[PDB]
């Protein structure tokens, strides 16, 4: 009964699908498309188009944020298909409406795009902001990023500016382009905008 308790503890944290390296292009293919079953309500104002109603209320604000079930940041939707409550190939459907609220309950599955960074992978990043203890990295200029002071190598140093942000000097002493290789350490989205955290030592 010792391992029987941990059997449920291990099957709730194991990641489903991993993102390996591809083409040795530095970064990795981490944009996956997970089909998910979504249980939602409707609105009587959009009875002439229930798929457009849920698309406007429960799907447009849904994009570009991190959720808890699939554990990533959604990057679009596709496969809008609704399910009926009786065996049918006609366009007309039926939705079980709650006898309490004017809204009806529908259970429809849709394939949602999502991007999830693991712990110990490699990603891209451009130059966004250069502070004394925080560099700005924008992978695909959509996902913000931040770094602490203890995740940078000892050789990498910073030099402040005098004319008009902060300058940086690497180990050898030559600047590089905006295209920057980067690793992933932590993720946080409960703030305003999604922002990932990474390290520079492997």
């Amino acid at each position: 009964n010792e391992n029987r308790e941990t059997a449920r503890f291990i099957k709730k944290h194991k990641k489903q699908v991993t993102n390996p390296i591809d083409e040795k292009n530095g970064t990795s293919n981490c944009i996956v498309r997970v089909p998910i079953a979504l249980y939602v309500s409707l609105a009587p104002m959009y009875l002439e188009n229930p798929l457009q109603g849920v698309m406007k209320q429960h799907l447009n604000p849904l994009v570009m944020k991190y959720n808890n079930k699939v554990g990533g940041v959604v990057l679009g939707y596709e496969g809008l298909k609704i399910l009926d409550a009786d065996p049918l190939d006609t366009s007309e459907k039926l939705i079980k409406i709650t006898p309490d609220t004017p809204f009806g309950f529908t259970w429809c599955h849709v394939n949602l795009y999502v991007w999830q960074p693991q712990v110990g992978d490699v990603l891209e990043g451009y130059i966004f902001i250069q502070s004394a203890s925080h560099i700005g990295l924008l992978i695909h200029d959509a996902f913000n990023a931040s770094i602490k002071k203890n995740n940078i190598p000892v050789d990498w140093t910073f030099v402040h500016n005098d004319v008009e942000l902060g300058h940086w000097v690497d180990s050898n002493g030559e600047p590089i382009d905006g295209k920057l290789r980067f690793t992933v350490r932590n993720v946080h989205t409960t703030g305003r905008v999604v922002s990932v955290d990474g390290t520079l030592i492997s």
Binding site: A43, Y46, K56, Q57, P61, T98, D100, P102
Partner: protein
């Protein structure tokens, strides 16, 4: 209930259960040790009864939830006990096993043939197999060799597994198990047979020795008895083949016999096929902790001059101070007689305190109290049925009760209501282009004059009053009743205006005491700005069986247009013209219009 915010789930089935010694440790947030509710200076204490951990108390900031007394739903806590206690809610049930279980063989004093016989017939009875139930009993083919008993058990398994297989195979029953109004009769008859079993006879067929009989002390301290000469002589021949009972002894007894007879115990305490395959333990009947209700539910009530805490706080405080007395008791023995008589008395008094918290008709007969303190179940049943005060019928809001009066010139369904009752009672109505002309009038008038509106609510679910805003604010708000929402997060909903009353809505009426179908009727109202009391009809009093000698009925108002629909088509007076008892129409004028009718339709009238 606000029509704006719906419910995202449904409750369709409920299952009971029992606490477990492992979960009674993690269901709380902080222990309660000191036998005090609060110290001086007027503030709670740490680890106290009214602690800030299990909920807020007296507008304090909750230490665990971090909210006030308007958003924190409370928490849970418990108290650690030195010895596991009994339970009158279960003592009358497991005592059958306590008096029937053997003390040396740890089995039931029956034989494994009949124990497995009842355990197998019941193992087939959970599904709809009442036909095969009695078919299991009529199998007997082949002090005696046990090999033939082994093939009997294998025969029970090979038959029940086949019968259940065919039942679960062809349409008879599902995996969830069928339950009708007859299988409970059979199971209750079988468990009552288990109570009328060997318990009323002697020798144990598995181990042939004399076991002493448990002498009931009645409402605590079950104690053993002695034996006689014909018992001790059997104690001599078994060689070649008024004392109190502590809690740990019966703890080990029930803990061993449960794991020893789990084959019959797993179903004797289960009505449905246990899919999860739980493991019931002896701790299901012995109480190790006493969970306390949240402080928000234990607010100290006050009535005039007397100020005191909740009733449960007295018994719980007695358990607290006595638990610490028996707690510090073992310290004297640890740092090593009458102190042994004081720990046995501590056991009897700790018991006499927790069972006093759970029951009152058992413990101390004090002198003229005039009334004892309601601990749990006599507060859950004030006059044996408190469930009727709250669980059955609530104190319904939006009510109106006053004397009645008859009116003529009413077509059997109008109810004259005064403006003093019309201004208070209100009704919600969402805003749209559907009532842009009438709703702007109800808002521009206000609660001062009829027809008006009392309260205005926005899309975000906020409350805006109008009793303290002038007509200029009524104009600035009248030009805001039709306006799109702030964000798309509330684009589907709209504002709701609470208007007083109209001549088109439906209103419910009831007369006390109601005793039939026609004593509960709904009609439409027609206001009259004349006087103070209610108005009735000449034909409605015949159905209500009410008079005008001081009788007064109720005026209830529905809060939903669906309630208005069923009260206009179903609960309407026309559909209740005929009472469903014998076909006698309870309707029609009674005395004056017929006494004048005889003179009207007579031939001596031109």
């Amino acid at each position: 209930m606000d029509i704006s915010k719906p419910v995202g789930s449904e409750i369709t089935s409920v299952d009971f259960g029992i606490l477990t010694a492992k979960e009674i440790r993690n269901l709380s947030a902080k222990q309660i040790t000191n036998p005090t509710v609060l110290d001086n200076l007027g503030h709670p204490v740490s680890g106290g009864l009214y602690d800030l951990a299990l909920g807020a108390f007296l507008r304090n900031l909750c230490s665990t939830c971090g909210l006030d007394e308007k958003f924190c739903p409370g928490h849970q806590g418990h108290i650690e006990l030195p010895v596991p206690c009994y339970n009158p809610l279960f003592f009358n049930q497991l005592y059958i096993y306590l008096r029937a279980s053997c003390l040396f063989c740890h089995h039931f004093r029956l034989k494994s043939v009949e124990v497995h016989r009842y355990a197998c017939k019941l193992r087939l009875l959970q599904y709809g197999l009442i036909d095969e139930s009695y078919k299991l009993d009529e199998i007997t083919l082949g002090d005696i060799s046990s090999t033939l008993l082994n093939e009997l058990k294998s025969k029970r398994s090979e038959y029940v597994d086949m019968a259940i297989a065919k039942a679960l195979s062809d349409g008879r029953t599902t995996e969830r198990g069928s339950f009708t109004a007859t299988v409970n009769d059979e199971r209750k008859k079988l468990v009552h047979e288990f109570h009328k079993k060997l318990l009323s006879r002697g020798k144990c067929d598995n181990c042939g020795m004399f076991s002493p009989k448990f002498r009931k002390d009645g409402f605590t301290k079950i104690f053993e008895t002695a034996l006689n000469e014909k018992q001790i002589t059997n104690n001599r021949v078994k060689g070649f083949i008024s004392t109190y009972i502590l809690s740990t002894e019966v703890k080990n007894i029930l803990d061993t016999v449960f794991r020893k007879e789990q084959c019959v115990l797993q179903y004797v305490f289960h009505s449905r096929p246990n899919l999860s395959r739980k493991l019931v333990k002896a701790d299901s009947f012995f109480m190790d902790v006493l969970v306390v209700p949240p402080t928000r539910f234990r607010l100290p009530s006050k009535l005039g001059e007397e100020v005191h805490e909740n009733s449960q706080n007295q018994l719980l405080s007695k358990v607290l101070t006595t638990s610490l007395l028996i707690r510090d008791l073992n310290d004297d023995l640890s740092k090593l007689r009458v102190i042994f008589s004081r720990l046995m008395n501590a056991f009897v008094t700790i018991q006499n305190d927790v069972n006093a918290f759970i029951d009152s008709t058992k413990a101390q007969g004090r002198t003229s109290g005039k009334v004892p303190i309601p601990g749990v179940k006599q507060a859950l049943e004030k006059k044996e049925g408190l469930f009727r005060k709250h669980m059955m019928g609530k104190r319904v809001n939006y009510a109106a009760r006053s004397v009645i009066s008859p009116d003529p010139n009413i077509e059997t369904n109008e109810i004259g209501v005064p403006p003093v009752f019309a201004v208070k009672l209100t009704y919600p109505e969402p805003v749209t282009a559907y009532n842009i002309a009438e709703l702007r009038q109800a808002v521009i008038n206000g609660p001062d004059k009829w027809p008006g509106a009392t309260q205005i609510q926005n899309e975000d679910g906020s409350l805006v009053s109008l009793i303290g805003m002038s007509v200029e604010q009524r104009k600035a708000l009248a030009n805001q009743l039709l306006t799109p929402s702030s964000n798309v997060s509330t684009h589907t909903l709209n504002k709701k205006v609470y208007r007083h009353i109209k001549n088109r809505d439906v209103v419910l009426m009831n007369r006390q005491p109601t005793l039939h179908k026609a004593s509960m009727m709904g009609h439409k109202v027609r206001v009259l700005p004349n006087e103070k009391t209610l108005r009735l009809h000449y034909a409605n009093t015949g159905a209500y069986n009410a008079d005008f000698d001081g009788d007064e009925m109720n005026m209830h108002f529905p809060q939903n247009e669906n309630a208005r629909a069923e009260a206009l088509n179903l609960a309407n007076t026309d559909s209740q013209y005929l009472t469903p008892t014998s076909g006698s129409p309870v309707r029609g004028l009674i005395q004056d219009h017929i006494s004048a009718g005889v003179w009207l339709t007579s031939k001596d009238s031109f």
